[PDB]
């Protein structure tokens, strides 16, 4: 089996080295170790093959090595892009088989803080015609990934009907989340307005919609 640490943390602009421990039957016996970077929801991308060779196009700042039965990936000049899960693999050495490590999720600290963009949609006429109503609060481009979402009906706080997602990383390497307020069409049309309040690092942004 190939063993990798579940998590690692490096500092922006600096380096991190991730280990991949196999056996003398695989990593110790052959120079067919590969390393893959995977962003959530995306296919893996190869960044090292044959232990220390950079696939075509891959920049110099990715490098690999092995000593004994342990292979290592080093990423220098850490960028926000580099946050992701890294997988090592090795030719099994005994038969045509690829072994994979369990992955290392890499956090890059020291990144600039980013406050969220917030977009609030009222219920569509098509949904109301279906006897339903959903307010949709979309939250994007924030870092680090943790927000609080609160809703108001007119000026009053409301917990009923609120469903809020966990934060998920975007292609821009910032986080996104969503919050949905389910209400009856009567609730929607009889209230002066509804507000979505999004808090991030003590900074709260508010958006408001109204039936009229």
């Amino acid at each position: 089996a190939l063993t990798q640490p579940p998590s690692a943390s490096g500092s922006l602009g600096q380096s991190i080295t991730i280990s991949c421990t196999g056996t003398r039957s695989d990593i110790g016996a052959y120079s067919y170790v590969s390393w893959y970077q995977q962003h959530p929801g995306k296919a893996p991308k190869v960044i090292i093959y044959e232990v220390n060779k950079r696939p075509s196009g891959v920049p110099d700042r990715f490098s690999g090595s092995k000593s004994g039965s342990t292979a290592s990936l080093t990423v220098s000049g850490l960028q926000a892009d580099d946050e992701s899960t890294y997988y090592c693999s090795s030719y099994a050495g005994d038969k045509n088989f690829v072994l994979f490590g369990g992955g290392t999720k890499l956090t890059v600290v020291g990144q600039p803080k980013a406050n969220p963009t917030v977009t609030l949609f009222p219920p569509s006429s098509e949904e109301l015609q279906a006897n339903k109503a959903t307010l949709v609060c979309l939250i994007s481009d924030f870092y680090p990934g943790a927000v609080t979402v609160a809703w108001k009906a007119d000026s009053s706080p409301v917990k009923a009907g609120v469903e809020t997602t966990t934060p998920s990383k975007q292609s821009n390497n910032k986080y996104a989340a969503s919050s949905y307020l389910s209400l009856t069409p009567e609730q929607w049309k009889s209230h002066r307005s509804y507000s979505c309040q999004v808090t991030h690092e003590g900074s709260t942004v508010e958006k408001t919609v109204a039936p009229t």
């Binding site: 067919y32 590969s34 893959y36 995977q38 296919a43 893996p44 991308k45 190869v46 090292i48 093959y49 044959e50 696939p55 075509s56 899960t85 997988y87 693999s89 090795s90 030719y91 038969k95 045509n96 088989f97 690829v98 072994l99 994979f100 490590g101 369990g102 992955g103 977009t119 949609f121 009222p122 569509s124 098509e126 949904e127 279906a130 959903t134 949709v136 979309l138 994007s140 469903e163 809020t164 997602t165 966990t166 998920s168 975007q170 996104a176 989340a177 969503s178 949905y180 389910s182 919609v209």
Partner: protein, 217 residues
């Protein structure tokens, strides 16, 4: 552009079968060592099979005798036939190109071109396709609310994949009922609410449902 495009899959009852397709573009599957790699929900990468240039197929122990990898060179397509499906076959399935060695009929065991992945769910659970509603305001945004579907996943594109700039698809929420909803959005200049019409293409393979919804603010 060099690429691999996967299709097939969906939700299959235990014991059933499904075939995945992996279509190559601008390189030939027969000139390469083509791998299948899978990833179970919340888990890491696991190797499934490889087919050598001569057609010889190799399999991981977990799928031996149940899966068959093959190629149709006339269609420049790699296949994975998955029989006697088990719940633990549930995963995203990737195909990938292994260029092999320069002078020898041997893999290098690293893969540089990958398909986008296709999801196979092995379950006896019932399914429900999404209802899609337009999102319009009332820099700005318009989008599609993809509501009340089960199970995951749904994929969303805009204008059949011709529109990628400013598109943001958000993670799904687990509703109080256990159904899922998500939203996808296009960012536009607030002046450009000048009435361009957009189409979101919602694919829910588990229920074999595809929805094109017109969004016109």
């Amino acid at each position: 552009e060099v690429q691999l495009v996967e299709t097939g899959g969906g939700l299959i009852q235990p014991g059933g079968s499904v075939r995945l397709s992996c279509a190559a573009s601008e390189f030939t599957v027969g000139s390469n060592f083509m791998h299948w790699v899978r990833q179970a929900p919340g888990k890491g990468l696991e190797w499934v099979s490889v087919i050598f240039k001569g057609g010889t197929a190799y399999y991981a122990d977990s799928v031996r005798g149940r899966f068959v990898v093959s190629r149709d060179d006339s269609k420049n397509t790699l296949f994975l036939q998955m029989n006697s499906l088990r719940v633990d076959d549930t995963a995203v399935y990737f195909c990938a190109r292994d260029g092999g060695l320069r002078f020898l009929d041997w893999p290098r065991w690293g893969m540089d071109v990958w398909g986008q992945g296709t999801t196979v769910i092995v379950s006896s659970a019932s399914t429900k396709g999404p209802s899609v509603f337009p999102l319009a305001p009332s820099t700005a945004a318009l989008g599609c609310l993809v509501k009340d579907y089960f199970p995951e996943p749904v994929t969303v594109s805009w204008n059949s994949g011709a529109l990628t700039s400013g598109v943001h698809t958000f993670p799904a929420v687990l509703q109080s009922s256990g159904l899922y909803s998500l939203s996808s959005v296009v960012t536009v200049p607030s002046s450009s609410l000048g009435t361009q019409t957009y189409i979101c293409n919602v694919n829910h393979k588990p229920s074999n449902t595809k929805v094109d919804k017109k969004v016109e603010p």
